[PDB]
Amino acid sequence: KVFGRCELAAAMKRHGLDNYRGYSLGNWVCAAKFESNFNTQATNRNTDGSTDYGILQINSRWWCNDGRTPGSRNLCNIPCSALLSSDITASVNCAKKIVSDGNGMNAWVAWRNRCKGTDVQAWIRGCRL
Numbered sequence: 121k122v123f124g125r126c127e128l129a130a131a132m133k134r135h136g137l138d139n140y141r142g143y144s145l146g147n148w149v150c151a152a153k154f155e156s157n158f159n160t161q162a163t164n165r166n167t168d169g170s171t172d173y174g175i176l177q178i179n180s181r182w183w184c185n186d187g188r189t190p191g192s193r194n195l196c197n198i199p200c201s202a203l204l205s206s207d208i209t210a211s212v213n214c215a216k217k218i219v220s221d222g223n224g225m226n227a228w229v230a231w232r233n234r235c236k237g238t239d240v241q242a243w244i245r246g247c248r249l
């Protein structure tokens with residue numbers, strides 16, 4: 121499913137991401153925009169053989185099991201395919217663990233490179249949240 125900008129903002133807010141660990145909602149919407157372009161089915165292979173999954177492009181090397189990343193970790197205790205669901209719940213719960221992992225949103229390279237330090241509020245502008 122490809123979410124609408126405000127549609128995703130609403131879904132994320134409902135799942136308690138607005139200000140989770142001090143990161144305002146716009147940060148999360150911005151990260152999703154550049155990581156997957158709001159598409160829950162996004163997958164991208166990484167250099168070391170692992171793969172990123174979902175709207176938030178979560179890595180199989182550490183967070184989920186895809187059965188093909190020899191010696192990876194599954195810290196979110198879920199199969200990576202669960203991160204591709206039109207229901208973002210699993211992606212949100214796993215992201216909550218990632219952002220609390222000590223490096224905040226820097227875990228998301230698209231966020232560091234294109235969101236961090238910008239007017240992230242523009243991303244939820246116009247939405248009825």
Ligand SMILES: *[C@@H]1O[C@H](CO)[C@@H](O[C@@H]2O[C@H](CO)[C@H](O)[C@H](O)[C@H]2O)[C@H](O)[C@H]1NC(C)=O
Nearest residue numbers: 176177178179180181182183218221227228
């Ligand atoms: C993207 O890849 C990053 C590098 O592998 C990864 O960051 C690592 O996460 C580890 C989690 O146990 C640990 O904190 C390392 O110090 C850190 O470099 C990051 O989590 C990945 N991002 C996502 C969204 O999967």
